[PDB]
Amino acid sequence: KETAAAKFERQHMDSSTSAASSSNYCNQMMKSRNLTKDRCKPVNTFVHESLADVQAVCSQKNVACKNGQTNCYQSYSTMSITDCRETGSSKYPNCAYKTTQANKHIIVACEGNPYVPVHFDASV
């Protein structure tokens, strides 16, 4: 099994690029990060910032998670992100994703000691 922290890193961190390179960014990353193995993960965001910067969000603006949890945090500033969302031409095993680049606040849920992101709630 994966730690929640490591699963967040695998699903949501891409510090290697300042932003999505091509329209094929999502198809490549969703596969690469093993998010299309059992099924097409329907929605998933990658954050193009350093891991320290994203971890730092756990000490930023305390907000509610969409399900009502109290351990969500909104980043004070916007971040470079890529939203990956399954499109109409997508059918497992042939997953197809729309790539949408944006610069927005992120909201994550945090847990543990050290207190780190374990869930990507939303972007605003």
From Swiss-Prot:
GO terms for molecular function: lyase activity; nucleic acid binding; ribonuclease A activity; RNA nuclease activity. Pancreas. GO terms for biological process: defense response to Gram-positive bacterium. Its main location: secreted. It catalyses: an [RNA] containing cytidine + H2O = an [RNA]-3'-cytidine-3'-phosphate + a 5'-hydroxy-ribonucleotide-3'-[RNA]; an [RNA] containing uridine + H2O = an [RNA]-3'-uridine-3'-phosphate + a 5'-hydroxy-ribonucleotide-3'-[RNA]. It comes from Bos taurus (Bovine). The active site is at H12 (proton acceptor), H119 (proton donor). Interacts with and forms tight 1:1 complexes with RNH1. Dimerization of two such complexes may occur. Interaction with RNH1 inhibits this protein. Monomer. Substrate binds at K7, R10, K41, P42, V43, N44, T45, K66, R85. This is Ribonuclease pancreatic. Belongs to the pancreatic ribonuclease family. Keywords: Disulfide bond, Endonuclease, Glycation, Glycoprotein, Hydrolase, Lyase, Nuclease, Secreted, Signal. Glycans are attached at K1, K7, N34, K37, K41. It is found in: Secreted. It is an enzyme of class 4 (lyase). Disulfide bonds join C26-C84, C40-C95, C58-C110, C65-C72. GO terms for cellular component: extracellular region. It comes from the Eukaryota. Endonuclease that catalyzes the cleavage of RNA on the 3' side of pyrimidine nucleotides. Acts on single-stranded and double-stranded RNA. Its EC number is 4.6.1.18. The gene is RNASE1. The chain holds residues 27 to 150 of 150 of the full protein.
